[PDB]
C-alpha cells in the first residue's frame, strides 16, 4: 500500500504537511495515495534545497511548507526589504544571493515539458525542475546550487524510486501524473 510506504519513507513533519496540504484542496490522503507521495517528495526536495545554505548565513528562505498566512508574511517581508517584485502566487524559496524567488518542480515525466507547464502557470521567478529520470532543468541553464548539492537531491529521488519499485508501487506512481 502506497500509504504505508509514504509514512515509512518520509519523516513525520513532511508527512503531516502533505496531509494538511491535500486536505486544504479537498483530497483524502488515504484515497489519492500517489498524489500524497508526490507532495511529500516535492516538500522534501524543497527542504533539502533549502538546507544547502560563503557570505550569507542562510542563503535561502524557505516558503513552501508554511501556512499561507506565514508564507505571505515572509514573502512580503523579503519584498518590502529587498525591493524585489512581489509574486502573484507563493513560490517555494527565495535566494538571498541572487535576490530572486525559486519555484521547484519535481516530475516523473521529462523535465522539458514540465518546465514549460510550470512557466506558463506563473515570470521573474526562477524555475528549477528535477525528475525521477535523474535529469534537471533551470531557467537560463542556471542551477543555483553547486553540483555536489544537486547530486544529493538526485540520489534521494533515485533512492525513493528504487524503494517504490521494490514494492511494485513505482509503476503506478509513474503513470498517475496525468
Ligand atoms: O506540492 C504539490 O502540490 C501542492 C498541493 C496541491 C494539491 O494538494 C492539489 C492541487 O490541485 C495542487 C496543489 O499544488 C501544490 C503545489 C505546490 C508546488 O510548489 C508545486 O510545484 C506543485 O506542483 C504543486 C505537488 C507537487 C508535485 O510536484 C506533484 O507532482 C504533485 O502531485 C503535487
Ligand atoms: O488562522 C490563523 O493561523 C493559522 C493559519 C491559518 C491559515 O493560513 C488558513 C486558515 O484557513 C486557517 C488558519 O488558522 C491557523 C490557526 C492556527 C492556530 O494555532 C489556531 O489556534 C487557530 O485558531 C488557527 C490566524 C488567524 C488570525 O485571525 C490571525 O490574525 C493570525 O495571525 C493567524
Ligand atoms: Mn510550492
Ligand atoms: Mn513547487
Author numbering: 0 to 52, 70 to 138, 141 to 196
Quote the study on this structure:
Influenza virus replicates in the nucleus of infected cells where the heterotrimeric viral RNA-dependent RNA polymerase, with subunits PA, PB1 and PB2, is responsible for replication and transcription of the single-stranded viral RNA genome (vRNA). For influenza, cap-snatching involves the binding of host cell pre-mRNAs via their 5′ cap structure to the PB2 subunit of the polymerase followed by cleavage at nucleotides 10–13 by an endonuclease activity which resides in the PA subunit of the polymerase. The endonuclease domain is at the N-terminus of the PA subunit and has a core fold similar to other two-metal dependent nucleases of the PD…D/E…K superfamily. Here we describe high resolution X-ray co-crystal structures of the 2009 pandemic H1N1 (pH1N1) PA endonuclease domain with a series of specific inhibitors, including four diketo compounds and a green tea catechin, all of which chelate the two critical manganese ions in the active site of the enzyme.
Epigallocatechin 3-gallate (EGCG) is the ester of epigallocatechin and gallic acid and is the most abundant catechin in green tea. EGCG, a polyphenol with antioxidant properties, has been extensively investigated as a possible antiviral or anticancer compound. It has recently been reported that EGCG inhibits the influenza endonuclease. Co-crystallisation of the pH1N1 PA-Nter Δ52–64:Gly truncation mutant with EGCG gave a new crystal form diffracting to 2.6 Å resolution. The compound was clearly observed in the active site as well as anomalous scattering peaks corresponding to the two manganese ions. Strong extra density also exists around a 2-fold crystallographic axis and represents another EGCG molecule non-specifically trapped by crystal packing. The two manganese ions are co-ordinated by two of the hydroxyls of the gallo-group, whilst the galloyl-group is orientated towards helix α3, stacking on Ala37 and Ile38 and hydrogen bonding to the carbonyl oxygen of Val122. The double ring of EGCG is orientated towards the preceding loop, with notably the resorcinol moiety stacking on Tyr24 and making a hydrogen bond to Glu26. However three of the eight hydroxyl groups of EGCG do not make direct interactions with the protein. The configuration of the EGCG in the active site is quite different from that previously proposed by docking studies. On the other hand the binding mode of EGCG is well-defined although possible interactions with some of the hydroxyls in the compound are not fully exploited.
